[PDB]
Amino acid sequence: MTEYKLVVVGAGGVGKSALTIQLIQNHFVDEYDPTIEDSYRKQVVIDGETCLLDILDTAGQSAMRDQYMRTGEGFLCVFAINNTKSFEDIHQYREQIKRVKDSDDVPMVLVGNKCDLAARTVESRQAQDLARSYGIPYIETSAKTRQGVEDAFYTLVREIRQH
Ligand SMILES: Nc1nc2c(ncn2[C@@H]2O[C@H](COP(=O)(O)OP(=O)(O)O)[C@@H](O)[C@H]2O)c(=O)[nH]1
Ligand SMILES: CN(C)Cc1[nH]c2ccccc2c1[C@H]1NC(=O)c2ccc(O)cc21
Numbered sequence: 001m002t003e004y005k006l007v008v009v010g011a012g013g014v015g016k017s018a019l020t021i022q023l024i025q026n027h028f029v030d031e032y033d034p035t036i037e038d039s040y041r042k043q044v045v046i047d048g049e050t051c052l053l054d055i056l057d058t059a060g061q062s063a064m065r066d067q068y069m070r071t072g073e074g075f076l077c078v079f080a081i082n083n084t085k086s087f088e089d090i091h092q093y094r095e096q097i098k099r100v101k102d103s104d105d106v107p108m109v110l111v112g113n114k115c116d117l118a119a120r121t122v123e124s125r126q127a128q129d130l131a132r133s134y135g136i137p138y139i140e141t142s143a144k145t146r147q148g149v150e151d152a153f154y155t156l157v158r159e160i161r162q163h
């Protein structure tokens, strides 16, 4: 069966761990050690094919990150809709990925997490404009309610598969 190396990247506190654990274990973990960087495996059927997902939940403890950028086939670039800095940070993650991969066409999905929260500081339109300039999909998610979580990951698998 086909294996996919997915990397979850983004500023600390955006919900990278909560998104990964919600996909893998089907539950919301509100307290997960922000220093642990761990991998999770999951066998899933995507468009009638059995896939093996190897997902790296990055922790940010920059050249040491190159190793998972080299192994990684697709990147889930996560920001929180109530963290302007995490949205502005995306430009930096995108550039490092492009440089390490030596390519302008790397499978990526921009994810705006914590969509259950009120008073958002990053508008959907701003992230759509950012995603359009990169030529990648934008999806909003909530690791808390599980909204868009399967979609964000399976869309990234499709971006890799269709590359
Ligand atoms: N309301 C809400 N809180 C979330 C969501 N995802 C994560 N959180 C919270 O955001 C904080 C950081 O989450 P975490 O997964 O550790 O982020 P990471 O540093 O990017 O791994 C914790 O307090 C989580 O409970 C979400 O979709 N909605
Ligand atoms: C092989 N798997 C059991 C673990 C695993 N899953 C991944 C999914 C996407 C990208 C990389 C990986 C890795 C590791 N391979 C690396 O290069 C690397 C760098 C830092 C890490 O923390 C982990 C890894």
Ligand code: NA
Binding pocket: 016, 017, 018, 032, 033, 034, 035, 036, 057, 058, 059
């Ligand atoms: Na984390």
